[PDB]
Amino acid sequence: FNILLATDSYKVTHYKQYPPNTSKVYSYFECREKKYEETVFYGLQYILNKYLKGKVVTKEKIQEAKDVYKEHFQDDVFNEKGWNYILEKYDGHLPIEIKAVPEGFVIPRGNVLFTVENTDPECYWLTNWIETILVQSWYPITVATNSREQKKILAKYLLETSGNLDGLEYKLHDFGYRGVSSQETAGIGASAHLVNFKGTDTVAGLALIKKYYGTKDPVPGYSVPAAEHSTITAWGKDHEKDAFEHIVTQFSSVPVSVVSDSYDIYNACEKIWGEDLRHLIVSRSTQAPLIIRPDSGNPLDTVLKVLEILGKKFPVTENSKGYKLLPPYLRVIQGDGVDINTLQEIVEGMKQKMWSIENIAFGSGGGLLQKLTRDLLNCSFKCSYVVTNGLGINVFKDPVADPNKRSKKGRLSLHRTPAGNFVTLEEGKGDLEEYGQDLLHTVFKNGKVTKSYSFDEIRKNAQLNIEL
């Protein structure tokens, strides 16, 4: 990886555009106000460690960048002297200070999350060079936030239909490995989901957490044996029952998920599980349920009909809240068409039909890890303060046609209000000490990571109020 080639092309030309005698450029990241009222701050530590810390500049990396940019711009605009200064003066360590809110912190929209400034006047251009790399923090923030918003929905309906939150942390499983844009995205997004939940098939998340964050536990996430269409259909259309019997016999003493919609989900539930193989299900341990997996049709209609079928073939109980409960050897996972909108529709539809949320778990792939943009929380990096000719200037944009794109002015700090909420103070007003100490911590300075969070601390920070 070469940080000289890890920026938007136009940033190569910016050192020539700032006012002459600029010694400081100070910038900040926020999830701008435009429901998603609060965001989980997660993922900066990965970026600091993988891309920004240590000797990130070499003679070879400067020459490679110079040669690429000569052809890319058909011109010599690359700041070879600027990058040589960092190599010679700081042994290729970035003279940058980053201050950040602690990872896992849940912060309302429109608040400073991190700030970036140069620590050497010669490197005024370096602050916004690394905008592109740092702004990619939008992705883990947005995955972690969207995953937590789904946990809030599941927690509300599980508490209402069961009276407790038992099994909440296994109710939204990451199915998204095949449905993301790259191996690197898979690791980052799966790790962001595991801030809120413990169930993942995106194995890439485990190694990222272990290398960059750390857990007391051997692994941060768990899975179970499960079928796919290929392991059912390989037996032939007329032998679906033989596939089912083989798979539940192979996994007789652990939980096993079996996709049941290869030909006819309703037939599979009522005739194959419900009659032909019923003797192999009712014998199973509470620690080894069969989880029936529909994977096609209208998500709500399919879940309700599957539960109606299973409710007639298996002994249903009524829990202490008056909701119906399958026997403990039998559960359902809906792994198709799940996003934050359909998840809400399904748990509401189950509640209206008196089915406990105890009965169901969700799998989400594209909806969880891919169907998200930087526009969802309006993640944005802007210059708010410069020093030119030794004089500090509060700087901002304020486009006439979009007040939502107005940026904050001057040196920023994050504070608790007297009522215990968050406020971002602008124009250096944090210095007045009317709001106590700045909640941002220096996490990066002059090529070193200076403060860091375990994955266990991030999980505690990101807990729901209902969990607390």
Ligand X SMILES: COc1ccc(CN(CC[C@@]2(C(C)C)CCOC(C)(C)C2)C(=O)c2ccco2)cc1
User: Contact letters (x/-) for a second copy, 96-135, by CB under 8 A?
Assistant: --------------------------------x--xxx-x
Q: Does 287 bind ligand X (CB under 6 A)?
A: yes
Q: Assess contact for 326 and 316: CB atoms under 8 A.
A: yes
Between CA 104 and CA 62 the distance in angstroms is 36
Pick from 82, 102, 110, 167 the residue near ligand X by CB under 6 A: 167
Q: Does 185 bind a second copy (CB under 8 A)?
A: yes
Pick from 92, 95, 104, 221 the residue near a second copy by CB under 8 A: 221
**Region at 117 (left for phi over 0; alpha for psi -120 to 50; beta for the rest):** beta
Count of beta carbons in the 10 Å neighbourhood of residue 137: 24
Sequence-distant contacts of 427-436: CB under 8 A, at least 24 apart: 427/394
What is the DSSP pairing of strand 391-394 with strand 379-388? Answer: antiparallel
Stretch near ligand X under the rule CB under 6 A, chosen from 126-134, 211-219, 285-293, 300-308: 285-293
Q: Does 140 bind ligand NCA (CB under 6 A)?
A: no
Q: Classify the C-alpha dihedral 260-264-265-269 as positive or negative.
A: negative
Instruction: Find which of ligand X, Cl ion, a second copy, none residue 59 binds, CB within 5 to 8 Å per kind.
Output: Cl ion
Interaction residues for a second copy, span 437-456 (CB under 8 A)? none
Q: Assess contact for 274 and 314: CB atoms under 8 A.
A: yes
User: Contact letters (x/-) for ligand NCA, 191-210, by CB under 6 A?
Assistant: ----------x---------
3-class secondary structure, 232: helix
Considering the complex, what minimum distance in angstroms separates the CB of residue 356 from ligand X?
A: 10
Between CA 398 and CA 271 the distance in angstroms is 65
Instruction: Find which of Cl ion, ligand NCA, ligand X, none residue 8 binds, CB within 5 to 8 Å per kind.
Output: ligand NCA
Nearer to ligand X, 36 or 170 (CB): 170
User: Contact letters (x/-) for Cl ion, 227-266, by CB under 5 A?
Assistant: -x--------------------------------------
Between CA 116 and CA 127 the distance in angstroms is 6
Q: Does 296 bind ligand X (CB under 6 A)?
A: no
SS3 for 363-387 is EECHHHHCCCCCCCCCEEEEEEEEE
415, β-bridge pairs: 423
Pick from 32, 36, 38, 51 the residue near a second copy by CB under 8 A: 51
Cα 315 to Cα 312, 331, 355: the distances in Å are: 8, 13, 14
Chain discontinuities in the chain, listed by preceding residue (C to N exceeding 2.5 Å): 34
Interaction residues for Cl ion, span 42-81 (CB under 5 A)? 58-59
Interaction residues for a second copy, span 261-320 (CB under 8 A)? 261-267, 295-298, 302
Residue among 116, 197, 186 nearest 150 (CA): 197
Nearer to Cl ion, 58 or 370 (CB): 58
Considering the complex, what minimum distance in angstroms separates the CB of residue 291 from Cl ion?
A: 13
Interaction residues for ligand NCA, span 248-267 (CB under 6 A)? 257
Considering the complex, what minimum distance in angstroms separates the CB of residue 26 from ligand X?
A: 26
Instruction: Find which of a second copy, Cl ion, ligand NCA, none residue 296 binds, CB within 5 to 8 Å per kind.
Output: a second copy
Instruction: Find which of Cl ion, ligand NCA, a second copy, none residue 58 binds, CB within 5 to 8 Å per kind.
Output: Cl ion
Q: Does 363 bind ligand NCA (CB under 6 A)?
A: yes
Pick from 159, 165, 203, 316 the residue near a second copy by CB under 8 A: 203
**Region at 420 (left for phi over 0; alpha for psi -120 to 50; beta for the rest):** left
Annotated binding site: 178, 201, 229, 293-295, 335-336, 366, 374
Between CA 342 and CA 336 the distance in angstroms is 10
Q: Does 347 bind a second copy (CB under 8 A)?
A: no
Query: Phi/psi at 425 (nearest 5 deg)?
Result: -90, 135
Residue among 347, 364, 344 nearest 173 (CA): 364
Pick from 168, 206, 226, 281 the residue near ligand NCA by CB under 6 A: 226
Sheet holding 360-364, edge to edge: 172-174, 360-364, 330-334, 290-293, 256-259
Q: Does 226 bind a second copy (CB under 8 A)?
A: yes
User: Contact letters (x/-) for ligand X, 339-368, by CB under 6 A?
Assistant: ---------------------xx-------
Residue among 230, 218, 303, 232 nearest 266 (CA): 303
Q: Does 85 bind ligand X (CB under 6 A)?
A: no
Annotated binding site for diphosphate: 178, 229, 293
Between CA 414 and CA 408 the distance in angstroms is 13
Q: Which residues bind ligand NCA (CB under 6 A)?
A: 8, 10, 175, 201, 226, 257, 293, 335, 363, 365
Binding interface with ligand X (CB under 6 A): 167, 170, 173, 199, 222-224, 226, 255, 257, 287, 289, 291, 331-333, 360-361
